[PDB]
Structures are given as structure tokens and as C-alpha cells.
Amino acid sequence: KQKRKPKPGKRQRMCMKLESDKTFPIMLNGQVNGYACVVGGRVFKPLHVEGRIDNEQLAAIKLKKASIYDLEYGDVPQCMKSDTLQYTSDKPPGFYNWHHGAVQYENNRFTVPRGVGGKGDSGRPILDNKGRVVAIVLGGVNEGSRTALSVVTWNQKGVTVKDTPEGSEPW
Amino acid sequence: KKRPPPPAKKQKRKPKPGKRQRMCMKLESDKTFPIMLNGQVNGYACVVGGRVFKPLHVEGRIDNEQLAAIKLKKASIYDLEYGDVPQCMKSDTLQYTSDKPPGFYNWHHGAVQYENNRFTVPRGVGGKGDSGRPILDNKGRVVAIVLGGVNEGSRTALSVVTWNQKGVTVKDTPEGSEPW
Amino acid sequence: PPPPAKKQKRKPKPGKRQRMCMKLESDKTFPIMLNGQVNGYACVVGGRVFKPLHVEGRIDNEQLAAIKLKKASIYDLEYGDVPQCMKSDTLQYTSDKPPGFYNWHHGAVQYENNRFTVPRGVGGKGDSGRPILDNKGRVVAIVLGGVNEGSRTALSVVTWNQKGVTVKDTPEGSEPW
Amino acid sequence: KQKRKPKPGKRQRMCMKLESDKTFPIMLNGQVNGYACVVGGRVFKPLHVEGRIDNEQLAAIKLKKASIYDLEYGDVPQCMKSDTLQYTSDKPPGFYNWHHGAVQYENNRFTVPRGVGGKGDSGRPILDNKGRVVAIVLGGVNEGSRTALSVVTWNQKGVTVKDTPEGSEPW
Amino acid sequence: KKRPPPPAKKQKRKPKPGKRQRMCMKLESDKTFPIMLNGQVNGYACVVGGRVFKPLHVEGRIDNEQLAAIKLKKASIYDLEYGDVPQCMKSDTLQYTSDKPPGFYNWHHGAVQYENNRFTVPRGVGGKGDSGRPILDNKGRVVAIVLGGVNEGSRTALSVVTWNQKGVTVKDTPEGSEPW
Amino acid sequence: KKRPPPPAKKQKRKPKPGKRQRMCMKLESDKTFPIMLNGQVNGYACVVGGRVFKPLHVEGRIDNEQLAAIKLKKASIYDLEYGDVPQCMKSDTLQYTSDKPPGFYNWHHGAVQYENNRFTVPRGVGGKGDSGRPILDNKGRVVAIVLGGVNEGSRTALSVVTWNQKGVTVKDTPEGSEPW
């Protein structure tokens, strides 16, 4: 409850920025297990968890099997489609947004510190500080000092392609 | 047994000649570790951006149970060893680039610069006991690892293992480099 | 409460007419959402509950979502009742219609031309099934639909006649809400 | 420091432990028909009461009809298991706790006054001044000025009952 | 390098909230010793009133040459090991009783109490890495040694190995206890 | 963490009874090293003027990788071992003479003098655990190394291994010397 007069800025540019974004978890236990986030025209529900979406018009969608991606893609109604997560395709090396931390981009691998994301949280999008998603996390993986996220991103030709560091965790 | 909050016994006096700790402060902060043959230091070993570059020429054990009890095969075409690095020394250790500009890179025993193609340090660097040193930026970014190279008049020219402009791992070596 | 949280309360206290939305505090209809989007509401009246046939979902109240209704085709609704907590139906009965202004959820309608009437586009898609309320809290008319009337906008309602017998009051070319 | 009390009687006035050890209601279409919780790591839900537990993790427990006990027993998971309270083998003759008032042990019978209880929430356990579960209450008839209830007292040996005095109606 | 007779760098300030060091001061003063598998602590081991209770489930070496180079057979019916304790860790180490009242016993990661039959600590105790902990009195007297036991809502219920009221070495164990 | 140039925590007070540190200051400054059998000190070992005199009676390892991993044969006619000393412990370690005058020589557990032929220290010296001690001058010059010898009333007479007046390595030994 400390109220001094420092520099604000959400520390660090995720605290409202992820929270305003429409990523909706519902577990069978009524909690998070893996995040369905609306991305452009489609929502990316995790394939390898069990649960639904915190929206009646999004959880009632039938979603197609992206075993290519370890997620599921499906329709997003227009009542969500404007306020979907606008994306970006590029990924320069830099600090990006994570609601538990931050990735620093390195060697096509997005790296939160150890124990920050990966397990029980993934599908949380990775946001630009300019405010764009690069990638959707699948789970894992502990890289010791840090933790590289197994992500699903666009490439240089803008192709939605799953990345998997070896031995990654299932969500 | 008293209670100050004391800063800095050694090297934070108010008179500073300079702040050229880029060859000392980052290099000790690197995850480099000696290959001590019966305690005798015959070359340092370090994890570089992924795989570890253990000196294949140098025998002895390393200050890491994740590295010393760890069998590595032979890059005898370069006199190197690879990794096989466990995850606990992954995600930030000795990032780099493949190229080098004609600029100031470093290690433990001083800094390196050369005009065209190669690497040279001033005379008195030592190639024995130390070699196996990554060649970091003022940013802290490797370009090579020391193979030695003889003292040459004013400056010790270096042999290294390094990378191509195409990123291909190569070795730069003058005639009659120094052992490790 | 450090910025205004209504505890500084207010200078203009009730020195004039009370409100027109105190009877919308008695709005015991429910936001019938077919997949998160309100198509209509479920109107209790006399305990006998209904909702328009144009509307699917249905109901955030688990009670009213558990009662199978009966289709009234030429009233464009499906009717049933509310079991075992029935005086939640504050939405009681009007039939008497003096040509005045009766409370509706986006402002009071105008009654004239045997018709309840809001201004231009005051309705919205979702305003089907809304009750139209007396200043006694009594509910006269249940919005099936409506149609724009240039300066104002009609309301196709389920209301009653002078005998109090139900009527699908419908303007020509009315559309759902 | 949050009490704000001028001079209260120093007694556990049926909310410090009793509302803290709240026994979860059994609602059926809004109308609460009983209470139900877990004591001793085994679920109790009254057999004379239909409806739904507050907890999803308890309402998903398939229960076994103890027909000579008017309870539908099963097993809690870990999720509450430590909070499933307490008992020591005694029935001291005197006033006990109650989620509306007080009940008196008298002649192997629980004497609560009239009006208090006997309504339609019939699963509250009588609690001790030690907070120990005394008796899950299932029925009871107004014995005029006072009221005896259908309870589980377990016994002097800790062995369960359906302790129903005569004429007692399941509330 | 000066000459005071100084007391207590760390924890003898004049403000004291309490004196509940019975779970910390005696327990470190106990002759308990970690089983560190390659340095990684996977369970402590301790001499209790005679024989040592080495975790049979846990591999690694112990901080005692009188205990680590010392072969112990299998109480796999309880997942324990016995002693075989040399005399240098005999005559006072971890006295005990067989029973337990419904009262406050302890270890490293907090205190334990339970109403009837068993042992429960609050949630967050850890069963991994620590288990092999003796359960001492405020007097300092064991009643059990931790087998684990899952977090259960508010409190972590425990599995232990313990003793009968007849003194018979038994195990108390909930369904699905935690490993070590 | 402060900055004095401080002298001498322990033993440089201004009151001095004497300066008889010739049995303690030189002897610790000697290159003597314990033979610790499982850590238990059963005799010191030292390089003397060349070859090392390892106690052949005493088992265990030595605080020197140049001495402990170093196989030495048996002078069982004297119960000694020889050297085989690497050059890093050569050129000044425990110079000596062969003779002894009836004078004050020393080690760790006190000083030695005897009238005619032999060596005796006062009672309470210990022969167990320590023996393998060189017998230095106030100059710092060996004449023998302790074999033990029993407490004899007032003074502990000693057995040693020593040298002849002709320099021949011999042993002086009373009847029933002490083990090591």
C-alpha cells in the first residue's frame, strides 16, 4: 500500500496490457490450466488441457484439432473479434511482456526466468512493449537460470508455426 | 563482530583512473571455469551460448559437477570439445556474434584488437595455463576462444578458434602458435 | 474511498420528482443471452413467466432456465411460471392505459395511437422482452419488437385490451429487437 | 486491530468459530434446502435434503445412502480434508453452540428453544466451545417452548446415530 | 582485526516477538545430517536414541564418515534404514517417547499438532528434499520421523514412521503420501 | 568491513613472559604434515634435508599431493619411509646435523634435553598421535625424529630415529618405547 511518487508504467508494461487482453481460462476445476486467447480472427485454446473459455460465445465454438500446434483454433464472434489480440510477425531481441515476468528474445526462443511461466499458465500470450503478440506459449521449458517458452509464432514470411525447444512441458 | 552496512573493502575508493573493467568484471562474472590438472591451472573452460568449449588439449578436472564428470568427444580437427551442457548453465552464458570488427575484445589477461583478419594482444599475455578464454565485447559478447599464438615483438599475435562471417566455426592460427 | 465514491454524497438531494428508474430496480427480468449476447429478457408477470419466441439462450437465473415453457405462436412468446419463489415477480399488472408515459428500460415510452413509443433508435438489438412499467410499478407491455416512426420508434408489445385480454399489438412492418 | 466493541460478554458468540466453520448450504433453484459439509474427512449431506453443495468439489462427490442415518456419506478429497473438524467423546450437560442460538444437553437429548432452527436448512452441526463438531442436525419438532432435534451425538464411544426424539420432523 | 568481546551478530536484538526457537534451535543442535545426492538435498538423516534412521528411499551421501561409508540394510516394510551407529554419536542424540499427545511437536519446516491419531502441519511444508526429519518436543523429544503426506487444503497432513503406544515401530500414512 | 592496517589479533600483546617460540614458531613453519587416518591424526610426517621421513608404522594420508599419492618403500629395520621428494619441497626444508650435544632441541609438544646419549622430555608429551616429529635446534636444525618412548617418572624418555656421529642413520630406543 506504498503511495510514493515514482515513475509509473505498469512495471513492466504488462499489468494492464495483458489484463486488458481477452485471454480466457476456465478449468474443469474452475481455474487456470492453459489460456485460450483470441488472436486476430481466431482463438487458440490449448489442446493438451481440459476446460473451457470464460465467454459463452467463445466456449461454445467448435474448435479444430491443431495437433500440428498443440492448441485448438476456432471461430471468434464479432462481439469479440474487434477486441482480439492484434499480432506482430517480427521478433527483434528485446524484453517482451509476460504477466509473470518477461521474456528476452534469444535464438528463436522466448525465455522467462526460472519458475515464472511454462507450467499451469501457458497460452498466456507474449506481448510486445509496443503491444502486439509475437507468440502463444505451449508450456515449459526449464532452462536452469531461466525458462524458455515453447511458443507458436509467425515466421519471417508470416506463417503461423509452432516452435518447440526440446523436452518442453505440457502446459 | 559489529553492525555497519559497509560497502566495498577493496576497489571502490573515490579516485578512479578509469572504468575499464570490461576485461575483468564481466569475465569473472562469466561462467568460465578452470581445468586444473592436479590443481595446476592449464586452461580455463567455459560454456558459450549453448555448448561448452572444453580445451581438448588440456587435461584435468573442472569446477563444475555438471561439466567435470561429463564425457565430451573430440573436435581434434580444431582441438576443441563440445556440449552437452545441462540446463542449469543454459539461457544466458556467453552470447556472441560470428564476425569481429577491428575493435576491442578482451579476456582475463587483457584486451585484443587487430586491423584486418586476426587477433593480437600486447606482449606478456601468457598462452600457457590460461588458454581457453572467450573473447568478449564491451557489451560482453564472444567472438572467439584463445588458442595461444606467439609473442611477436611488441604485441602477442593470437591463435584462436572463432567463427566465419558465414558463422562457420573456424580457427585463426599464425605459424607456431602457443600451447595451452 | 479516496476519489469520488459517492460518500461526499451530493448537493441536489430529493427536492423534486423521485426517479424514473426506481422501477428498473424492480426489473426482475433476466438478460437472456444466447452465447453472451442479450437477445431478450424473460418477463415474469403475476408469477406467470414468459419470454419472446425470437429469443434463445437462455437465462442466467438457474430457476427460470429450468422451467419448460409453452409456445404462444400468435403472441410470439413461450409462457410458463416461476415455482416456489414467486413474489420475486414485482412486475405486476396495469391494464388501464391513460395516454401517458410509462417506464421502459431506456427511458419512458410515449403512449398514443394505441401504441407504446420511444424516440428514434432508442431501442436496440436485445430490447425484445423488455417490460414497460407504470409509475405504480405495474407492467403494461412486453416488447416483442418495434419499428422506426421517423422522429420516434414504435414498440410491438404484448399488452392487454380494455377487458384485459392479451393482444399482440404490432405496428406495420415491425422488426424484432 | 479490528473489533470495535464497547463491552461484550467474553463468549464465542456463534460467529467466531461457527461462521468460520461454515457448513455449506444445499440450494435447489435458489431455495436452500439444507446444509452439508465434511466432518472427519468424510462428506455428510442429509438424505432427506435434495439440492446442491456450495462447493463444486463436494457436489461432485458421489454419496452413499446411510438410510438409518439420514446422511449421504462419501469422501472429501485433500481440498478440505484438514478443515473437517473435530470431536472428543463427551456430551457435557449444558449449553452448546448453534448457528442461530444455543442448544442444551438434557436427558440424552438436545434442547434448543422454539423457533430457533427447524426451518429448511437442516445440515448444520452443533459445535462445541472448543469448536468440535457435536451434532449434524437433520430434523426436529417444536417441543412447545423449546425444541428437540434429530441429530448425530455420535455416542459415548464415538459411534454414529440418527438421534431422533419422537414426532421430530425433518426440517 | 580488533578486540571486542562481541555478542551475537544476527539474532539477539533487544526486540523479541517470541522465543519459539524450539523448532529451530534444538533441531539444528540435533545430530541430523543431509543425504545430499550430488549435493542436492533429498532428505535429512539423523541418529535417534540409538540406531540411525537413514531414509531408505533417498540416495546420496551423508555429512558423517561414521554414517556415509556405512552400509545399512532395508526396512522396506517401512522404507527405513537402521543402525549401526558408532559410539561417537551415542549417549545423547534424539531421545524420545513412543506415544504422542495431541500437542506441539516440530522440525525444520515448522511445528506439528493433530487432534486424534496423526500429524498435520500447515500448508507449504515441503515433503520433497526435507523428509527424514525427527519430530521433537519443546523438551526436545522425538515421536516420529516424517514420511511426507500431501498438502490438504489449509494444513499439510503428514505421513510418518512412528511408534505404537506399545512402543512398536509403526508408520502413520494417509492415502497418497508425498515422496522425499 | 573496515580499513585499518591491523597487527596481530592473538599473541602480540605488550606483556611477554618470554620468547621461547623456538619449539612452536619454527615447527609450524616447518614443512611437517599430518598422517590423518580417516582424519584422525596418528603422526606427523615431514621432509628432512632431502628425503621425507614418513612414519612406516602410521597409516593414512598426508596434507600434500606431492607426498600422499606417493609410494614409499619400507625401512622396517628402523620403521621408517624414505624419499622421493619432488623439487617443490626441496632446497630448504629441515636442515640438520648428525650429532647432538646435551642441549635443548624441541618439537610441537615441548623441548628435549638429555645428559649423555639419549633424549628425554618432561612427562605428558604424548607418543600416540604425534610421533613423526623432527627435533630442531633453536637455530632450527633437526637431530632426530621421535619414535616415542615411555613416560618415566618425572620425564618422558624418548625413542627416536637419529644419526651416528659418523652420520649413519640409527635409532635410539629405550626398552618398551611408545607407539605412534
PDB file of all heavy atoms in Angstrom, chain E residues 1-3 65-66 88, chain F residues 4 6 8-10 13:
ATOM      1  N   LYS E   1      40.994  -6.119  12.165  1.00  0.00           N
ATOM      2  CA  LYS E   1      41.291  -7.116  13.187  1.00  0.00           C
ATOM      3  C   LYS E   1      41.373  -6.447  14.555  1.00  0.00           C
ATOM      4  O   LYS E   1      42.430  -5.953  14.947  1.00  0.00           O
ATOM      5  CB  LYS E   1      42.603  -7.836  12.874  1.00  0.00           C
ATOM      6  CG  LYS E   1      42.616  -8.601  11.559  1.00  0.00           C
ATOM      7  CD  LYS E   1      43.930  -9.347  11.381  1.00  0.00           C
ATOM      8  CE  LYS E   1      43.955 -10.139  10.087  1.00  0.00           C
ATOM      9  NZ  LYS E   1      45.210 -10.931   9.958  1.00  0.00           N
ATOM     10  N   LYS E   2      40.260  -6.437  15.283  1.00  0.00           N
ATOM     11  CA  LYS E   2      40.149  -5.701  16.533  1.00  0.00           C
ATOM     12  C   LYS E   2      39.729  -6.632  17.665  1.00  0.00           C
ATOM     13  O   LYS E   2      39.438  -7.813  17.458  1.00  0.00           O
ATOM     14  CB  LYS E   2      39.151  -4.544  16.391  1.00  0.00           C
ATOM     15  CG  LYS E   2      39.616  -3.455  15.440  1.00  0.00           C
ATOM     16  CD  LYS E   2      38.607  -2.325  15.349  1.00  0.00           C
ATOM     17  CE  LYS E   2      39.081  -1.254  14.384  1.00  0.00           C
ATOM     18  NZ  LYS E   2      38.108  -0.135  14.267  1.00  0.00           N
ATOM     19  N   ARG E   3      39.698  -6.079  18.884  1.00  0.00           N
ATOM     20  CA  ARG E   3      39.405  -6.836  20.103  1.00  0.00           C
ATOM     21  C   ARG E   3      38.193  -6.286  20.852  1.00  0.00           C
ATOM     22  O   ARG E   3      38.355  -5.533  21.826  1.00  0.00           O
ATOM     23  CB  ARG E   3      40.599  -6.827  21.055  1.00  0.00           C
ATOM     24  CG  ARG E   3      41.839  -7.566  20.607  1.00  0.00           C
ATOM     25  CD  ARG E   3      42.893  -7.431  21.697  1.00  0.00           C
ATOM     26  NE  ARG E   3      44.163  -8.069  21.370  1.00  0.00           N
ATOM     27  CZ  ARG E   3      45.239  -8.018  22.150  1.00  0.00           C
ATOM     28  NH1 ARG E   3      45.196  -7.360  23.301  1.00  0.00           N
ATOM     29  NH2 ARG E   3      46.357  -8.625  21.779  1.00  0.00           N
ATOM     30  N   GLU E  65      31.504 -39.363   8.207  1.00  0.00           N
ATOM     31  CA  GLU E  65      32.235 -40.558   7.808  1.00  0.00           C
ATOM     32  C   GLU E  65      31.856 -41.761   8.654  1.00  0.00           C
ATOM     33  O   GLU E  65      32.049 -42.900   8.214  1.00  0.00           O
ATOM     34  CB  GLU E  65      33.741 -40.314   7.892  1.00  0.00           C
ATOM     35  CG  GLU E  65      34.240 -39.293   6.892  1.00  0.00           C
ATOM     36  CD  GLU E  65      34.093 -39.764   5.458  1.00  0.00           C
ATOM     37  OE1 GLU E  65      34.237 -40.979   5.206  1.00  0.00           O
ATOM     38  OE2 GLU E  65      33.825 -38.916   4.580  1.00  0.00           O
ATOM     39  N   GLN E  66      31.310 -41.533   9.845  1.00  0.00           N
ATOM     40  CA  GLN E  66      30.729 -42.592  10.654  1.00  0.00           C
ATOM     41  C   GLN E  66      29.319 -42.958  10.217  1.00  0.00           C
ATOM     42  O   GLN E  66      28.693 -43.805  10.859  1.00  0.00           O
ATOM     43  CB  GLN E  66      30.712 -42.179  12.127  1.00  0.00           C
ATOM     44  CG  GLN E  66      32.087 -42.046  12.752  1.00  0.00           C
ATOM     45  CD  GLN E  66      32.023 -41.618  14.202  1.00  0.00           C
ATOM     46  OE1 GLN E  66      30.944 -41.368  14.739  1.00  0.00           O
ATOM     47  NE2 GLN E  66      33.181 -41.525  14.842  1.00  0.00           N
ATOM     48  N   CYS E  88      30.753 -42.644  18.977  1.00  0.00           N
ATOM     49  CA  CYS E  88      30.970 -41.202  18.984  1.00  0.00           C
ATOM     50  C   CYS E  88      29.697 -40.400  18.744  1.00  0.00           C
ATOM     51  O   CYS E  88      29.698 -39.187  18.976  1.00  0.00           O
ATOM     52  CB  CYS E  88      32.020 -40.836  17.936  1.00  0.00           C
ATOM     53  SG  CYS E  88      33.654 -41.530  18.270  1.00  0.00           S
TER      54      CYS E  88
ATOM     55  N   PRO F   4      41.598  -0.725   8.786  1.00  0.00           N
ATOM     56  CA  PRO F   4      42.865  -0.481   9.472  1.00  0.00           C
ATOM     57  C   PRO F   4      43.988  -1.209   8.759  1.00  0.00           C
ATOM     58  O   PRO F   4      43.722  -2.023   7.861  1.00  0.00           O
ATOM     59  CB  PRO F   4      42.625  -1.061  10.869  1.00  0.00           C
ATOM     60  CG  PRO F   4      41.706  -2.189  10.614  1.00  0.00           C
ATOM     61  CD  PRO F   4      40.811  -1.761   9.481  1.00  0.00           C
ATOM     62  N   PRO F   6      45.861  -3.588  10.544  1.00  0.00           N
ATOM     63  CA  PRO F   6      45.917  -4.062  11.934  1.00  0.00           C
ATOM     64  C   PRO F   6      46.994  -5.116  12.138  1.00  0.00           C
ATOM     65  O   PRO F   6      47.140  -6.052  11.335  1.00  0.00           O
ATOM     66  CB  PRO F   6      44.512  -4.641  12.151  1.00  0.00           C
ATOM     67  CG  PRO F   6      44.131  -5.154  10.804  1.00  0.00           C
ATOM     68  CD  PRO F   6      44.838  -4.325   9.780  1.00  0.00           C
ATOM     69  N   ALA F   8      48.133  -8.347  14.336  1.00  0.00           N
ATOM     70  CA  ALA F   8      48.222  -9.371  15.381  1.00  0.00           C
ATOM     71  C   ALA F   8      47.079  -9.454  16.392  1.00  0.00           C
ATOM     72  O   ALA F   8      47.205  -8.907  17.495  1.00  0.00           O
ATOM     73  CB  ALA F   8      49.529  -9.187  16.137  1.00  0.00           C
ATOM     74  N   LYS F   9      45.936 -10.016  15.968  1.00  0.00           N
ATOM     75  CA  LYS F   9      44.837 -10.377  16.873  1.00  0.00           C
ATOM     76  C   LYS F   9      45.298 -11.069  18.156  1.00  0.00           C
ATOM     77  O   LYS F   9      44.898 -10.674  19.258  1.00  0.00           O
ATOM     78  CB  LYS F   9      43.858 -11.320  16.165  1.00  0.00           C
ATOM     79  CG  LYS F   9      42.989 -10.742  15.073  1.00  0.00           C
ATOM     80  CD  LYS F   9      42.087 -11.847  14.524  1.00  0.00           C
ATOM     81  CE  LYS F   9      41.165 -11.356  13.430  1.00  0.00           C
ATOM     82  NZ  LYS F   9      40.326 -12.452  12.881  1.00  0.00           N
ATOM     83  N   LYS F  10      46.131 -12.103  18.034  1.00  0.00           N
ATOM     84  CA  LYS F  10      46.231 -13.129  19.071  1.00  0.00           C
ATOM     85  C   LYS F  10      47.341 -12.891  20.091  1.00  0.00           C
ATOM     86  O   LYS F  10      47.059 -12.710  21.279  1.00  0.00           O
ATOM     87  CB  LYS F  10      46.417 -14.499  18.408  1.00  0.00           C
ATOM     88  CG  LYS F  10      45.203 -14.968  17.627  1.00  0.00           C
ATOM     89  CD  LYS F  10      45.428 -16.337  17.013  1.00  0.00           C
ATOM     90  CE  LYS F  10      44.210 -16.781  16.216  1.00  0.00           C
ATOM     91  NZ  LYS F  10      44.408 -18.117  15.589  1.00  0.00           N
ATOM     92  N   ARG F  13      50.478  -9.013  22.392  1.00  0.00           N
ATOM     93  CA  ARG F  13      50.343  -8.064  23.484  1.00  0.00           C
ATOM     94  C   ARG F  13      51.719  -7.550  23.898  1.00  0.00           C
ATOM     95  O   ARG F  13      52.751  -8.190  23.674  1.00  0.00           O
ATOM     96  CB  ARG F  13      49.669  -8.712  24.693  1.00  0.00           C
ATOM     97  CG  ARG F  13      48.207  -9.084  24.530  1.00  0.00           C
ATOM     98  CD  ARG F  13      47.703  -9.702  25.829  1.00  0.00           C
ATOM     99  NE  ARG F  13      46.308 -10.122  25.765  1.00  0.00           N
ATOM    100  CZ  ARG F  13      45.675 -10.737  26.759  1.00  0.00           C
ATOM    101  NH1 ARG F  13      46.314 -10.999  27.891  1.00  0.00           N
ATOM    102  NH2 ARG F  13      44.404 -11.089  26.624  1.00  0.00           N
TER     103      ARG F  13
END
